[PDB]
Design a protein around this ligand. Structure first.
Ligand SMILES: N[C@H](Cc1c[nH]c2ccccc12)C(=O)O
Length: 308
């Protein structure tokens, strides 16, 4: 029997810890107890910042990284931080995994990728009402990676930071809101601090579950087939779980914390998407500079959406 330590950064109630426990449960069952997983939520073994270098060094066998936290490190997979028009985490998670499977880009070659998934589409959660793009001008809003670049294009003032830091940051006025999926309203009780939600339907945050290469290779071939066997299935399961939970989280925020929901005029939606168009070209150029083929990646994303 082997035991793998699985490091995670956010609290146990958030969906990246929920999916980790479900994955562990499937591993235990399909390997008939030949593999066990000891999980460490809340940064008790590795936090957001040292997660990648701590999995690669062996301080943890398995870890969960939010790709948007590591700008310039993932030139190919960061395409998934651009607005690709996904409305569900299930479809996004599934396409992300299939894209990774077919490309196996070199940026992730020093680790073994066990599975991937994404958040749901991002929205604005603010302390003060955002009813139009004008209200957003100058406003300090939390994002990370390309979601920050989207905020800047909209005229907001992006402040980049990992999730576990955001509550204190809101609570003390350093930021006026955040740009992400609405599950955090409940799971991290942002419904108490940010009383306003504005629909944006924007890019998702992509994640990878990563494993130390040596640890992966000391596993028997049949255990390895079980874990690879779980990859696509779990990507879909996570997105599915998250799409339902967003609905629950939001019903709970509205009818037990008075959260007000807003929607942008049709001309603001139009203008906002024109503003962000140039992020696709800046993404392609950064990718091309690091040796990847942005044309094939975009071709592949297109084909996989036409199919999920
Ligand atoms: N805000 C993004 C993605 C995200 C959405 N929900 C959670 C919950 C816990 C951690 C991250 C996220 C991010 O910071 O990665």
């Amino acid at each position: 029997p082997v035991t793998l330590n699985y490091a995670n950064f956010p609290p146990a109630s958030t969906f990246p810890c929920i999916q980790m426990e479900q994955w562990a449960h499937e591993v235990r069952t399909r390997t008939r107890g030949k593999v066990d997983v000891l999980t460490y939520p809340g940064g008790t073994l590795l936090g957001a910042r040292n997660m990648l270098r701590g999995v690669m060094s062996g301080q943890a066998d398995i870890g969960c990284i939010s790709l948007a936290y590591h700008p310039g490190v993932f030139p190919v997979m960061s395409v998934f931080e651009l607005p690709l028009g996904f409305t569900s985490a299930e479809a996004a998670s599934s396409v992300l995994w299939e894209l990774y499977s077919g490309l196996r880009p070199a940026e992730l070659e020093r680790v073994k990728v066990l599975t991937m998934f994404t958040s749901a589409p991002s929205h604005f959660m603010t302390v003060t009402p955002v009813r139009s793009l004008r209200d957003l001008q100058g406003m300090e809003i939390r994002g990370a990676g390309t979601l920050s670049a989207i905020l800047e294009k909209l005229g907001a003032t992006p402040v980049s930071m990992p999730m576990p830091e955001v509550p204190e940051a809101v609570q003390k006025g350093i930021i006026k809101g955040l740009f992400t999926s609405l599950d955090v309203m409940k799971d991290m009780n942002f419904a108490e601090m940010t009383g306003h939600v504005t629909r944006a339907d924007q890019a998702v945050y992509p994640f990878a579950v990563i494993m130390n290469r040596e640890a992966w290779e000391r596993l028997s071939p049949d255990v390895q087939q079980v874990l690879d066997g779980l990859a696509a299935e779990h990507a879909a399961w996570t997105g599915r779980y998250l799409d339902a939970h967003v609905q629950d989280s939001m019903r709970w925020a509205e009818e037990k914390h008075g959260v007000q929901v807003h929607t942008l005029p049709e001309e603001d939606i139009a203008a906002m998407r024109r503003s962000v168009q140039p992020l696709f070209d800046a993404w392609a150029q950064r990718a091309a500079d690091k040796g990847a083929d942005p044309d094939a990646v975009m071709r592949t994303v297109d084909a996989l959406k036409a199919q999920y």
